[PDB]
């Protein structure tokens, strides 16, 4: 439902560090 | 065809920094 860099179907991912 | 974090179909997106 949150984080970054992460899922499958919603939206997060990843994308920095 | 290929980078970080960035298309939407073959793989690469973002993730990592």
Redesign the interface.
Known sequence: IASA?CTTXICT?????
Do not use: E, K, L, Y
């Open positions: 860099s991912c990843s994308c920095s560090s």
